[PDB]
A paper describes a structure:
[name] excises uracil from uracil-containing DNA to concurrently form a covalent bond with the resulting AP-DNA. Structurally, [name] is highly similar to family-4 UDGs (F4-UDGs). However, [name] is unique in possessing a flexible R-loop (105KRRIH109). Our earlier studies allowed us to propose a reaction mechanism of [name], which involves the formation of a covalent bond between H109 of [name] with the C1′ position of the target deoxyribose sugar concurrently with the uracil excision from this site in DNA.
Substitutions of His109 in [name] with Ser, Gly, Ala, Gln, Cys and Lys showed the loss of its covalent complex formation with DNA but gained canonical UDG activities. In the reactions of the mutant proteins with ssU9, the entire substrate was converted to product by the H109G mutant, while hardly any substrate was utilized by the [name] mutant. However, H109 substitutions by Gln or Lys, showed poor activity. However, to better understand the mechanism of uracil excision by the H109 mutants, we determined their structures along with a pentameric DNA, TTUTT by X-ray crystallography. The DNA backbone could not be modelled into the experimental electron density map in any of the mutant structures that were determined. Nonetheless, all structures revealed the excised uracil and the side chain substitutions at position 109. The structures also revealed invariant interactions of N91 and H178 with uracil. When we arranged the mutants in the order of increasing cavity sizes (left), we noted that the canonical UDG activity of the mutants increased with their increasing cavity sizes to begin with and then with a further increase in the cavity size, the UDG activity declined (right). It suggested that the initial increase in UDG activity ([name] to H109Q to H109G) occurred because of the efficiency with which the water molecule could be localized to make a nucleophilic attack on the C1′ position.
Numbering used by the authors: 2 to 207
Amino acid sequence: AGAQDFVPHTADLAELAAAAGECRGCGLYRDATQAVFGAGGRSARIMMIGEQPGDKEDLAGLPFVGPAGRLLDRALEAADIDRDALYVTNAVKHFKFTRAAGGKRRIKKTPSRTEVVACRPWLIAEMTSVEPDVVVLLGATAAKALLGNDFRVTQHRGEVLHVDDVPGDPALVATVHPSSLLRGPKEERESAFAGLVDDLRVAADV
Ligand SMILES: O=c1cc[nH]c(=O)[nH]1
Ligand code: SF4
C-alpha cells in the first residue's frame, strides 16, 4: 500500500532520502522534478511538517525555500528557534501542480487524502529516525496526516495534542501554514504572524 515497499529498513536520513528519489508510491513522482525529503539532523528535538514542496523547493531539492519559507524563518527567529536545529519536511514529497497561461509560477494543487496516506510511510520513517519531542504541523494537510481527515487546525490553535498511533508519542502542535500569512489585510497578517510565533513557542517549550 502506497510508499511502504519503497521505504528501506534504515533510520539513516541520507539513505531514506535517496530511496525516496525512487518512490512510485503514488502518481506525483511523474511530473515533479525530484522528491524533496526533509532537511535537518536526527538530533533534532523539533520536527516541522508542511504540505508539499512548492515550485522553488521542487527545483532546490530542499523544503521551505520560497516566500513561505522566508516568512517561516522570520517567525522561527522571533520565536528564538534555530532552523538549523530542526528537522523540516512535508506530508507529501513530490510537488503536485499545474501552470496557468500568463502565470509567474507553477501553481500547487492540493494533495488528495489518498496521496497523503500513500506518502505517510516516509513521515513515519522520518519520525522513527529523528524521535522528535514535538511535531509542528503547518497547515491542514500536514495536521490531518497525523490527526485525522476531519481535523480542523482553526479549532485547536495553541494546543498541545497527543495521539496514540504516532511513533514515540511526541507532542503535536497544529498551526497555520506560513503561506496563509503572505496575503490579506495588514492587521490580519500581523495578528496571524503573532499567533504562529505563539504556537512555535508552545512547541519549543515542550
Ligand atoms: O517545503 C514547503 C514549501 C512550501 N510549502 C510547504 O508546505 N512546504
Ligand atoms: S508523493 Fe510520496 S508516495 Fe507519492 S511518489 Fe512521491 S514520495 Fe512516493
